[PDB]
């Protein structure tokens, strides 16, 4: 399960996110050496569960909203990769009145300049 494929069960194949293993022989036994990924150097940011535009709620898919003190952005949860929030980053659902802490924001439409 480790050598022939990437495991997905925590701490089974290394103390981290697991990439590979290589076997080495030993007397009356075997030795495994696991290659693992470990993140570091975290930074504190500001969040909002959802944003309201045109009176409608947009949730993020494949990311989370963050504020860097200048403008809102969406990033991966593991590595800091900000990208400008645009229509295809999000899907509309529900309504703004139903949810807690929604923040007024503007989402870019990339068909706006083409017209």
């Amino acid at each position: 399960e480790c050598v022939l494929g990437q495991s997905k069960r925590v701490d089974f194949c290394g103390k981290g996110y697991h990439l590979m293993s290589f076997p080495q022989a030993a007397p009356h036994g075997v030795v495994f050496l696991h290659v693992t990924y470990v993140p570091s150097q975290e930074r504190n940011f500001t969040t909002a569960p959802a944003i309201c535009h045109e009176g409608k709620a947009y949730f993020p898919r494949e990311g989370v909203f963050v504020f860097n003190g200048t403008s809102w952005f969406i990033t991966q949860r593991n590595f800091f990769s900000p990208q400008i929030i645009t229509t295809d980053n999000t899907f509309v659902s529900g309504n703004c009145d139903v949810v807690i802490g929604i923040i007024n924001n503007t989402v870019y439409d990339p068909l706006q300049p083409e017209l």
Binding site: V10, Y17, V38, T47, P49, F59, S93, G94, V99, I100
Partner: protein, 49 residues
């Protein structure tokens, strides 16, 4: 309560509980918008349990 799954690798990470739920729903193929629509119901059911 606060770190969630993140203190399994690295030291820990900070994330509000109600944002943890959107992730643990998205892990089961239920779209995360299910939670914030009726958060109160889930909370009451949890306490009754």
């Amino acid at each position: 309560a606060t770190a969630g799954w993140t203190f399994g690798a690295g030291a820990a990470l900070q994330i509000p509980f109600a944002m943890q739920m959107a992730y643990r729903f998205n892990g089961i193929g239920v779209t995360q918008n299910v939670l914030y629509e009726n958060q109160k119901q889930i909370a009451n059911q949890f306490n009754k349990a």
